[PDB]
C-alpha cells in the first residue's frame, strides 16, 4: 500500500542461485524473487537468463510500492551479477549507485576442504 520511490536491490548471486531482494533504503524488504521460484532447476537456475527473469519478477512484485530510484548492491560470485542489473534497468528503474559488497574475510574462518573431482 505504501510508496517509497527509492529502494535498494540486493542481488545475492551465488554459483547455484540468484536471489534478488528489493528493499526500502533502511533495510526492510519489499519483495524478492529467485531463479528457483522463477522456474529453473539445476543447470537452468545456475545461468544468467534465470537471474534476469528473477529480476523481472522482483520488479513486478514491488510494482505496488512505486519505486523509481534504486541503488544495487551486488554480492557473491555469480552467473548473474550483470544479468540481474540489466534486467532491472530494462524493467525501468533509474540505477543510481552500483556497489559490490561481496564479503571477503581478512584471513578468518577456514574454508571447507577441496573437492576431488
Amino acid at each position: 500500500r505504501k510508496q517509497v520511490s527509492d529502494g535498494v536491490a540486493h542481488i545475492h548471486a551465488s554459483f547455484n542461485n540468484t536471489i534478488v531482494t528489493i528493499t526500502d533504503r533502511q533495510g526492510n524488504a519489499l519483495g524478492w524473487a529467485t531463479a528457483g521460484g522463477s522456474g529453473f532447476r539445476g543447470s537452468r537456475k545456475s545461468t544468467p537468463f534465470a537471474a534476469q527473469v528473477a529480476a523481472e519478477r522482483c520488479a513486478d512484485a514491488v510494482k505496488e510500492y512505486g519505486i523509481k530510484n534504486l541503488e544495487v548492491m551486488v554480492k557473491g560470485p555469480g552467473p548473474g551479477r550483470e544479468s540481474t542489473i540489466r534486467a532491472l534497468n530494462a524493467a525501468g528503474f533509474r540505477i543510481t549507485n552500483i556497489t559490490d559488497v561481496t564479503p571477503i574475510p581478512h584471513n578468518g574462518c577456514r574454508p571447507p576442504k577441496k573437492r576431488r573431482v
Binding site: 543447470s43 544468467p48 537468463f49
Partner: protein, 154 residues
C-alpha cells in the same frame, strides 16, 4: 565436412508456375527418382488448394509455409561432457526446407486416400493453423523456449 564451403547446386523452376520454391517442394516430395509423378501430385494438390482456399496456387502455398516455418530450432552442444540443448535461429533457406519437409511427412501420415488429396488437406490445415505439421513446429518452438537459458552460452 571439414574443409569444404561447396557451392549450392542449381535447381530448375517448375514449368507450370516458374517457381524455385515450388520446384524444391516437388523434389522433396519425389520418391525413387520419379519426378513426373511428384510434379503431377503437387500440381493436383495446388489446384485443389487454390479452389478451396482462394487466391492462387503460389499464394496459398506461401501462406501454408508461413504458418509452418520455424524461427528457432535446437542443437545439442556437447562441451561440458554433458549435452546442452541450445536454441539457434534457423536461417531462411533452412526454414523453407524444414517446413516443406514437415509438410510432406505430415501429408504422408495423413489418412486421406490419394496422395494429392492428403497434400491438399494438409496444406489447407497448415493455412488455417490447425494441422499436424503446424503442431510439429509448435513442439519445436516449445523445446526452444524450454531451453532458452542455454541460448547465448554455447
Amino acid at each position: 565436412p571439414r574443409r569444404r564451403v561447396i557451392g549450392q547446386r542449381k535447381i530448375l523452376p517448375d514449368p507450370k508456375f516458374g517457381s524455385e520454391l515450388l520446384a524444391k517442394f516437388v523434389n522433396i516430395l519425389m520418391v525413387d527418382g520419379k519426378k513426373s509423378t511428384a510434379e503431377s501430385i503437387v500440381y493436383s494438390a495446388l489446384e485443389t488448394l487454390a479452389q478451396r482456399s482462394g487466391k492462387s496456387e503460389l499464394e496459398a502455398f506461401e501462406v501454408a509455409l508461413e504458418n509452418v516455418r520455424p524461427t528457432v530450432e535446437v542443437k545439442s552442444r556437447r562441451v561440458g561432457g554433458s549435452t546442452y540443448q541450445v536454441p539457434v535461429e534457423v536461417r531462411p533457406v533452412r526454414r523453407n526446407a524444414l517446413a516443406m519437409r514437415w509438410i510432406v511427412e505430415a501429408a504422408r501420415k495423413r489418412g486421406d486416400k490419394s496422395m494429392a488429396l492428403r497434400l491438399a488437406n494438409e496444406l489447407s490445415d497448415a493455412a488455417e493453423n490447425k494441422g499436424t505439421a503446424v503442431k510439429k513446429r509448435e513442439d519445436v518452438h516449445r523445446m526452444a523456449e524450454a531451453n532458452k537459458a542455454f541460448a547465448h552460452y554455447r
